[PDB]
Amino acid sequence: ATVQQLEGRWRLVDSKGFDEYMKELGVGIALRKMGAMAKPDCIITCDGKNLTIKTESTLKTTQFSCTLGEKFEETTADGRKTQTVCNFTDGALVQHQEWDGKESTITRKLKDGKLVVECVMNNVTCTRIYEKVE
Numbered sequence: 550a551t552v553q554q555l556e557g558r559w560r561l562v563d564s565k566g567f568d569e570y571m572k573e574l575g576v577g578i579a580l581r582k583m584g585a586m587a588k589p590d591c592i593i594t595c596d597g598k599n600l601t602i603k604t605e606s607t608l609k610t611t612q613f614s615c616t617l618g619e620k621f622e623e624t625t626a627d628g629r630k631t632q633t634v635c636n637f638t639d640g641a642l643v644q645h646q647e648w649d650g651k652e653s654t655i656t657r658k659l660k661d662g663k664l665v666v667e668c669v670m671n672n673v674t675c676t677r678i679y680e681k682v683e
């Protein structure tokens with residue numbers, strides 16, 4: 550398995566736990582409603598150790614870029630400014646966020662042709678499944 554295998558435009562087809570994850574973060578109701586109802590596309594591109602992940606929907610449209618293994622300032626959709634590191638480890642892209650003494654992890658994996666995105670903060674989890682747009 551390689552990081553290049555995650556490249557492409559992906560469309561959200563299933564979600565579990567995402568509102569609960571947003572509540573654990575303390576995201577306010579206006580943003581939670583947007584997250585519960587949005588069906589974003591995720592667009593992942595890489596070039597060696599360079600990675601970009603873009604999100605698109607009528608309700609919001611964010612993007613970050615990084616070098617694998619390098620700490621960087623990530624502005625999240627909910628407006629945190631985190632210290633983030635992304636690594637491709639044991640067949641998963643792992644995105645580790647730290648801010649204000651807190652931490653959250655997002656993983657992204659290829660399974661049976663689908664992109665599986667899993668989030669966690671303080672044992673509150675989500676699982677989101679995407680299918681390739683081609």
Ligand SMILES: O=C(O)[C@H]1CCCN1C(=O)Nc1cc(Cl)cc(Cl)c1-c1ccccc1
Nearest residue numbers: 571580583584587608625626627666668677
């Ligand atoms: O990319 C994904 O499938 C999931 C995994 C975790 C972030 N994510 C989103 O879809 N993000 C989000 C998507 C929408 Cl429509 C709205 C918000 Cl507020 C977020 C968001 C971002 C950070 C933390 C909480 C909510």
